[PDB]
Every structure is written in structure tokens, then in C-alpha cells.
mmCIF file with all atom_site columns, C-alpha atoms in Angstrom:
data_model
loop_
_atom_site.group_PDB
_atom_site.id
_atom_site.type_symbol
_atom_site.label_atom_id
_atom_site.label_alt_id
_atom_site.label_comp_id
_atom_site.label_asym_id
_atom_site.label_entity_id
_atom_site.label_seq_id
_atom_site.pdbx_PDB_ins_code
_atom_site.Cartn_x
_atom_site.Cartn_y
_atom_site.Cartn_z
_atom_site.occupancy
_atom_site.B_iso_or_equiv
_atom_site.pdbx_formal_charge
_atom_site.auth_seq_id
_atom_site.auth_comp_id
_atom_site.auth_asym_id
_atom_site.auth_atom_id
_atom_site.pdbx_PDB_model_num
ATOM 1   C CA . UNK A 1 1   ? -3.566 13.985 29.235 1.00 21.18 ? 1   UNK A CA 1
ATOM 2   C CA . UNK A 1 2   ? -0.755 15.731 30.840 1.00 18.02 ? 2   UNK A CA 1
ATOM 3   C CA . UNK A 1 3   ? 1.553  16.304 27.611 1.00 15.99 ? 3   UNK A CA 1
ATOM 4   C CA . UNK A 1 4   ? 2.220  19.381 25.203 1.00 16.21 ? 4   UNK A CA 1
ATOM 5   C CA . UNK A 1 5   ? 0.326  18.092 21.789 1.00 17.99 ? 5   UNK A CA 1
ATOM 6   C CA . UNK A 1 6   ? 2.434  20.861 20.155 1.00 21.10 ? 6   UNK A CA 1
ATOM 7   C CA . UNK A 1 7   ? 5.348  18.659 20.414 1.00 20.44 ? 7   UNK A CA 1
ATOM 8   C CA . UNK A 1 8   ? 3.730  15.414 18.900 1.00 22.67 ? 8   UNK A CA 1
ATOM 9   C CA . UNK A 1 9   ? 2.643  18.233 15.637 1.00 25.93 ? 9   UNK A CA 1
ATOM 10  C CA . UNK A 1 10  ? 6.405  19.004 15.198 1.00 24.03 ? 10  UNK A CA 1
ATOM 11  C CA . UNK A 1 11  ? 7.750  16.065 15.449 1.00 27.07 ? 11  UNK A CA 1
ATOM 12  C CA . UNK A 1 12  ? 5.138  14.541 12.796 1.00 26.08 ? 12  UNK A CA 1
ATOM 13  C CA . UNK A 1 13  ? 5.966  16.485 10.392 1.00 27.62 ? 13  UNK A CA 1
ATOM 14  C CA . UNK A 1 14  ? 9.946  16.830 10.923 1.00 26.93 ? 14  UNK A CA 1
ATOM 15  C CA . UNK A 1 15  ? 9.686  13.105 10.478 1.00 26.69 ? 15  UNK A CA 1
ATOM 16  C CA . UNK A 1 16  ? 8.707  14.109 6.317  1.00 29.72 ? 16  UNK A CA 1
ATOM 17  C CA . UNK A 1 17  ? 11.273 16.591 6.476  1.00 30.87 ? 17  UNK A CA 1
ATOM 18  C CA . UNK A 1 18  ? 13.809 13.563 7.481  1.00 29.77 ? 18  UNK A CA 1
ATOM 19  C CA . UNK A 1 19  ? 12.657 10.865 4.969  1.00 30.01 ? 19  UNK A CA 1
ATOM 20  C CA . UNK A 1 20  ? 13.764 13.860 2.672  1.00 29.18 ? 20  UNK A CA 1
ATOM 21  C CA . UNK A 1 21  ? 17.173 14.488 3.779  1.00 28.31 ? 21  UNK A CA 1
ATOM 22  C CA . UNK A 1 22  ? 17.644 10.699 3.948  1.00 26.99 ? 22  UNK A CA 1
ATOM 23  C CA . UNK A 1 23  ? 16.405 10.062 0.664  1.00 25.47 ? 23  UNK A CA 1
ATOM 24  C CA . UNK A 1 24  ? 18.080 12.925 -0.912 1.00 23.10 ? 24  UNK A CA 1
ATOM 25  C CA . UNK A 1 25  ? 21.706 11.272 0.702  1.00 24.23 ? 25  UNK A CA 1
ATOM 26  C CA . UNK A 1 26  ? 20.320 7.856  -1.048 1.00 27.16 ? 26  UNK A CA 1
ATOM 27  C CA . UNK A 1 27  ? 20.684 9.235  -4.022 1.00 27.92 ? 27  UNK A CA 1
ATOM 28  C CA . UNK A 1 28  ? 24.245 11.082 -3.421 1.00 26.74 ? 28  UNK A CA 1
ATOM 29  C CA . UNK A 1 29  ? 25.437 7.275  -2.335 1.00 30.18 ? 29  UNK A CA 1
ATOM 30  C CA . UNK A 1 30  ? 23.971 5.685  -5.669 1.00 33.80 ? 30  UNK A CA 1
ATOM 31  C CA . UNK A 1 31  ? 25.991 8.044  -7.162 1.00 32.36 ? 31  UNK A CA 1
ATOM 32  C CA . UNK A 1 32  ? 28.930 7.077  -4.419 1.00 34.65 ? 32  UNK A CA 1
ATOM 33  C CA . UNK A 1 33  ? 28.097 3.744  -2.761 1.00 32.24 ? 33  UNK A CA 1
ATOM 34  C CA . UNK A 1 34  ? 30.644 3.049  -0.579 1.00 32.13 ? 34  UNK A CA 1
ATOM 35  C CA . UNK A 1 35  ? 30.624 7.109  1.081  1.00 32.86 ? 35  UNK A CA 1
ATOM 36  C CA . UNK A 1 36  ? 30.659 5.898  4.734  1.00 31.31 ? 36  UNK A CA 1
ATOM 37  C CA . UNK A 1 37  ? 30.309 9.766  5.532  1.00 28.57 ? 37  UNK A CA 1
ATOM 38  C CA . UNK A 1 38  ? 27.051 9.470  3.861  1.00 29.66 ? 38  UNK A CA 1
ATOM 39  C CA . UNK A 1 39  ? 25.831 6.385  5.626  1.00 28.69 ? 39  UNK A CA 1
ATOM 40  C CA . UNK A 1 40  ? 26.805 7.874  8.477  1.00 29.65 ? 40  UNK A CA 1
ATOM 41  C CA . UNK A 1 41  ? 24.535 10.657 8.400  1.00 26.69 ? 41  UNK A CA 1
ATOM 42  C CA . UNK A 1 42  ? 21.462 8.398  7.051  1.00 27.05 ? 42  UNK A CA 1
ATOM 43  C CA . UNK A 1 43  ? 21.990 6.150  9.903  1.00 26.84 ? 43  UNK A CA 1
ATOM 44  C CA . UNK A 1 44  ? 22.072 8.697  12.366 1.00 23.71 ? 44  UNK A CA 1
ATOM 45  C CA . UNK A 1 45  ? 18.694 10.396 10.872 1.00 21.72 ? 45  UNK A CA 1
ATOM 46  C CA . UNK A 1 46  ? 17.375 6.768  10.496 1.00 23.99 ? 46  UNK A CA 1
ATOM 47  C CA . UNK A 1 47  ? 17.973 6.617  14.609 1.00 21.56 ? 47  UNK A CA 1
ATOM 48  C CA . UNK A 1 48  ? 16.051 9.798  15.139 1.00 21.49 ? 48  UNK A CA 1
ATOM 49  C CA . UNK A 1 49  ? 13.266 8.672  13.381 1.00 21.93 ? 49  UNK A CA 1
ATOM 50  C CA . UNK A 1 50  ? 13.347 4.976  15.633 1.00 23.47 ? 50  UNK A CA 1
ATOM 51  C CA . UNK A 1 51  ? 13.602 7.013  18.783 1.00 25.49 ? 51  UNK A CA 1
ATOM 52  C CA . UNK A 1 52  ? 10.803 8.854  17.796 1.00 23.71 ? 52  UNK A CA 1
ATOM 53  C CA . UNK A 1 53  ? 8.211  5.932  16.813 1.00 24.66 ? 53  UNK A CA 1
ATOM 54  C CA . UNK A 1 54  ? 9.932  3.878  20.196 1.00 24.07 ? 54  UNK A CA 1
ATOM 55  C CA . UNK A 1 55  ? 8.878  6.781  21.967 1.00 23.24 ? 55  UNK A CA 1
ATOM 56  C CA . UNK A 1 56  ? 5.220  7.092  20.081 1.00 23.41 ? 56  UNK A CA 1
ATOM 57  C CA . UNK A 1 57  ? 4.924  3.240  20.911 1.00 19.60 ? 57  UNK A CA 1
ATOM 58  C CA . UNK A 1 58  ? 4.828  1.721  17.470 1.00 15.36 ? 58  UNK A CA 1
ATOM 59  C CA . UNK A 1 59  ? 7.026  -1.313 17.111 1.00 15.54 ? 59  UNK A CA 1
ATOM 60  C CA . UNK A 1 60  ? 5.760  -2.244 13.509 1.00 12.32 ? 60  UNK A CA 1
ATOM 61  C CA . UNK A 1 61  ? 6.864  1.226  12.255 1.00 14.13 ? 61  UNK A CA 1
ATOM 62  C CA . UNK A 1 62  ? 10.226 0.884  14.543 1.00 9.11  ? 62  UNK A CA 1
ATOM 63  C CA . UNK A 1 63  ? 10.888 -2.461 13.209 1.00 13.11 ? 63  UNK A CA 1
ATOM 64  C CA . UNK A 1 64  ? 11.163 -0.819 9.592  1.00 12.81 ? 64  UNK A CA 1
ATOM 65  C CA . UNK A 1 65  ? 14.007 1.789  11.120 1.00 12.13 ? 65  UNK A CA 1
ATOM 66  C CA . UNK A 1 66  ? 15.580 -1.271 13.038 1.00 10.77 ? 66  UNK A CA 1
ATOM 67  C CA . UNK A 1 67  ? 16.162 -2.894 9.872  1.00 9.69  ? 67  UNK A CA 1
ATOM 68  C CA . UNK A 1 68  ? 18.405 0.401  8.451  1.00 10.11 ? 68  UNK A CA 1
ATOM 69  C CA . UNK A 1 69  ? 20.409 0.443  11.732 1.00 12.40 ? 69  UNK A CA 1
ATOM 70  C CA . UNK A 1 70  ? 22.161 -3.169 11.284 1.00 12.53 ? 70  UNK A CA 1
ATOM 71  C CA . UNK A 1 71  ? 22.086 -2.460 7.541  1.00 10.92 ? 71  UNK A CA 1
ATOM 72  C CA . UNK A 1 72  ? 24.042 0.603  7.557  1.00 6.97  ? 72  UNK A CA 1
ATOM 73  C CA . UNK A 1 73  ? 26.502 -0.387 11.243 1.00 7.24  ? 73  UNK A CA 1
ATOM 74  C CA . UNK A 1 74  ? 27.285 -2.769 8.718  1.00 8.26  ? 74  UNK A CA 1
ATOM 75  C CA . UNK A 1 75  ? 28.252 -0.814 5.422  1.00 12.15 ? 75  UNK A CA 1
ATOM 76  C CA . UNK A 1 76  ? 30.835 1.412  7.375  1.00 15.11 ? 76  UNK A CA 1
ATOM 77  C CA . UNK A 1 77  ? 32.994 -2.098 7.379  1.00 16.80 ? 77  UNK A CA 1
ATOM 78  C CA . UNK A 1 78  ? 34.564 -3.448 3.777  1.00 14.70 ? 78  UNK A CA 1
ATOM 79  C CA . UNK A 1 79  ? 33.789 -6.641 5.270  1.00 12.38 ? 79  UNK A CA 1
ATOM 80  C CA . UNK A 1 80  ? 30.122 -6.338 4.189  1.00 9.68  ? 80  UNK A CA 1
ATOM 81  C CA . UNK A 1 81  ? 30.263 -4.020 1.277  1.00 9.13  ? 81  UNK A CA 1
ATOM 82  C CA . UNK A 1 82  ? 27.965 -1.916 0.018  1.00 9.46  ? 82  UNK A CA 1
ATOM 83  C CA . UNK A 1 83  ? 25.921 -3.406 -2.825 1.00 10.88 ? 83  UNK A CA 1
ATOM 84  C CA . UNK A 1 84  ? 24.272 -1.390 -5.803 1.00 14.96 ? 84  UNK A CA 1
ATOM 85  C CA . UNK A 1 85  ? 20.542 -3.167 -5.035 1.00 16.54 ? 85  UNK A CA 1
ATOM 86  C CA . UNK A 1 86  ? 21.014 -2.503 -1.573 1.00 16.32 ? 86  UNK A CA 1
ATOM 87  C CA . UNK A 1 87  ? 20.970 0.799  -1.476 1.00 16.58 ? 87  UNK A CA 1
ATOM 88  C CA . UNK A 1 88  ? 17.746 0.820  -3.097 1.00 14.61 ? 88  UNK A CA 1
ATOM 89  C CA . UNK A 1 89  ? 16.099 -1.599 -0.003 1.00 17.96 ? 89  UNK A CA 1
ATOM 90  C CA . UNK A 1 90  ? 17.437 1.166  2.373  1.00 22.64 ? 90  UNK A CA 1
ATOM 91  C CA . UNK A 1 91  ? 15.406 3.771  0.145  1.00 24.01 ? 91  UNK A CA 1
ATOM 92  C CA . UNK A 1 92  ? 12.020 1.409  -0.500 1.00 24.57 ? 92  UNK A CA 1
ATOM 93  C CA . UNK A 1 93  ? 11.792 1.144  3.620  1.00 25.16 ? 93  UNK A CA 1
ATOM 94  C CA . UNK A 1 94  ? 12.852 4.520  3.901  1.00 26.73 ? 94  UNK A CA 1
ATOM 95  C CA . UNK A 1 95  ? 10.035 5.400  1.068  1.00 23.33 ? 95  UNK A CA 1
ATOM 96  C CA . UNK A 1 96  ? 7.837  2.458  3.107  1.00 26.95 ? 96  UNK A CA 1
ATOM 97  C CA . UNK A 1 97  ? 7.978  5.173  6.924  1.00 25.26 ? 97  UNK A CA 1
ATOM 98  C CA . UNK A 1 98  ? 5.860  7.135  4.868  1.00 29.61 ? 98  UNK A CA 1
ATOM 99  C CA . UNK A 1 99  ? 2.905  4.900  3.533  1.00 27.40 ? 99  UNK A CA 1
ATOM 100 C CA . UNK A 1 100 ? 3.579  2.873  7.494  1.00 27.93 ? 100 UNK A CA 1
ATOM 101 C CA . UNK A 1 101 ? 2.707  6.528  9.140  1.00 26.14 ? 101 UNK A CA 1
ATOM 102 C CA . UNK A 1 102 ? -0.259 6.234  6.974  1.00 26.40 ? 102 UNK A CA 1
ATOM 103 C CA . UNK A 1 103 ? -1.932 3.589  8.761  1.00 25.73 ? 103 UNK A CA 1
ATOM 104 C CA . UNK A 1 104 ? -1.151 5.699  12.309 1.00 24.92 ? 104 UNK A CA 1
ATOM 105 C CA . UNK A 1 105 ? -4.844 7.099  12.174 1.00 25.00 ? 105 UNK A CA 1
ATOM 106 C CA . UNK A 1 106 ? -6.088 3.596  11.847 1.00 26.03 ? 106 UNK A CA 1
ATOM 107 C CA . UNK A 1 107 ? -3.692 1.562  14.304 1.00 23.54 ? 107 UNK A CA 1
ATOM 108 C CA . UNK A 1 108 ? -5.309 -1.660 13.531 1.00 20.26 ? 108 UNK A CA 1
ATOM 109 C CA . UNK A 1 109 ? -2.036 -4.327 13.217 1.00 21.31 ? 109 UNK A CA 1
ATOM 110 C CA . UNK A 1 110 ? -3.675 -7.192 11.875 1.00 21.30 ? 110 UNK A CA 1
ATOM 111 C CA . UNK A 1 111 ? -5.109 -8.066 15.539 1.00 22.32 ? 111 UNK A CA 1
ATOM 112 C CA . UNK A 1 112 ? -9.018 -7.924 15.784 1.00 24.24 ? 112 UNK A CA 1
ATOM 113 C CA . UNK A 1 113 ? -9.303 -5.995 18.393 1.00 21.90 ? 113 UNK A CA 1
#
């Protein structure tokens, strides 16, 4: 394989580091739910980590970050609103990246083969 498996260890583990930062700004906007500044940083980190499992190949995984892209495009306008509940479906898929990386030493989606 011509590709630096250094990079791939990083980025692994600076995906932890940003289901932390993301989950720490959760809690900052169910303190403050409708802190656009703060949804716009977790949306932002949220598109880092997509990039990252696009780029990896996993659609199942990026399908979990796709979900927190519309959801949070969506809180920045009053239109929507930003409901108390909601917030915590952001964190239980954000909380779900975690358990979903789990299964990326398996890779066995459900198909048999």
C-alpha cells in the first residue's frame, strides 16, 4: 500500500479527542440552546469528522455525521428552533461515532459477505 499509516493513527484517535470537544459544547448549549456560536463550532467539528469517515470509505458511520449537518444548518435559523430534546439526539449520535467506530475492526454491515 502506498500510504503513510501514521496518518490513519492520528487521525483515529483525534476523532475521540473531537467527540470530546463536541460533547463538551453539547453541554454549554443545554445550558444555552439557542447559542448559534456554539452550533457553529459543533457543526464545523461534526464536518471534520464526515470528511474523515468519507475519506476512510464508511457511509454507515458518515450517514450518522450527515444527520448533524442538516440538523444544526438548520438551528442557526429561528425558523426551526432549537428544541430542549434535540439537543440531546445531536449528543446520543454524537455519543453513537464512538460505539459505530467500534464495529470498524469488524466491517461486517449486515451483508453476508
Amino acid at each position: 500500500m502506498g500510504s503513510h499509516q501514521e496518518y490513519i493513527k492520528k487521525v483515529t484517535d483525534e476523532l475521540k479527542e473531537l467527540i470530546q470537544n463536541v460533547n463538551d459544547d453539547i453541554k454549554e448549549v443545554e445550558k444555552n440552546p439557542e447559542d448559534m456560536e456554539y452550533w457553529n463550532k459543533i457543526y464545523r467539528l461534526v464536518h471534520t469528522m464526515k470528511e474523515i469517515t468519507e475519506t476512510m470509505g464508511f457511509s454507515s458511520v458518515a450517514k450518522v455525521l450527515h444527520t448533524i449537518m442538516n440538523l444544526v444548518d438548520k438551528m442557526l435559523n429561528s425558523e426551526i428552533k432549537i428544541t430542549s430534546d434535540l439537543i440531546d439526539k445531536v449528543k446520543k449520535k454524537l455519543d453513537m461515532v464512538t460505539r459505530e467506530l467500534d464495529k470498524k475492526v469488524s466491517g461486517s454491515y449486515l451483508v453476508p459477505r
